[PDB]
């Protein structure tokens, strides 16, 4: 149900920098990032039911949630503490510092609603994720 | 040092579908796709161009888990295949390769290669964003 998500949280985060709103978001996709020999970091495409936004990153202390598959595509999360940063190239990113998984992916089962990208950066993420899946699927 | 890579191999693969060459390429970035059996996408350089549509055959995954195939290492490809997909994207699947020099032996990205095509340019921009997001 879309109504159980924090409608408008993505727009408020991006345009006003709201950090106190404890948003309830669905994880749409997780992109592991493996730089050099370093342990992975996880970038997230998240949905508030209306929009998706791809500029989320998990703080390192939340990495075990992804490894344990507690935090996986289609689960629903309540974010407790997050910070907004503008990178040196102007891109606005959101670091998730503390959260709770409210519903596992299997309980939700699938993507909630039909959210659309909040910006071109997010549509570029969606394109690359679509590319990944296409390359992935060797057998038909 | 760029002359130590197979300059022009990416253009040969993409335009002519030449899989008889045994090109020497540098890994610029490796990324697992799923978050299941891992599957690795690679941004590779031939000294002139980068190309982001390389994927690793599952049987080469041990080289990645052993951290032998890693960003900045230089490899020689022994068997590969290139296909266009129904939607027109071209994908290169690396089937057999040897790591010639470790990431540490090479030490840095060789030269200043440019993206072969728009898809690679977007991939580099997105991967540079990924990295900027980490270093926070």
Residue numbers in the entry:
A (entry chain B): 1 to 123, 435 to 451
B (entry chain A): 1 to 35, 38 to 123, 435 to 449
What do the authors of the reporting publication say about this deposited model?
The heterotrimeric Replication protein A (RPA) is the ubiquitous eukaryotic single-stranded DNA (ssDNA) binding protein and participates in nearly all aspects of DNA metabolism, especially DNA damage response. The N-terminal OB domain of the RPA70 subunit (RPA70N) is a major protein-protein interaction element for RPA and binds to more than 20 partner proteins. The RPA70N domain adopts an OB fold with a five-stranded anti-parallel beta-barrel but has very weak ssDNA affinity. Its primary role is to mediate protein–protein interaction with its basic and hydrophobic groove and a side pocket, as first shown by a series of studies of RPA70N interacting with p53.
WRN has two tandem RPA-binding motifs with the same sequence localized between its nuclease and helicase domains. We fused one WRN motif to RPA70N, and the fusion construct crystallized in space group P212121 with two molecules in the asymmetry unit. Residues E439-R31b-D443-R43b-E442-R91b-E445 form a series of electrostatic interactions, and WRN M446 and L449 contact the hydrophobic patch formed by RPA70Nb L87b, V97b, I33b, M57b and I95b. Compared to the RPA70N–p53 structure, the direction of the WRNa peptide in the groove is reversed and the positions of WRN Y436 and p53 M44 are different. Mutation of the conserved arginine residues in RPA70N (R31, R41, R43, R91) greatly reduced the binding of RPA70N to the WRN peptide.
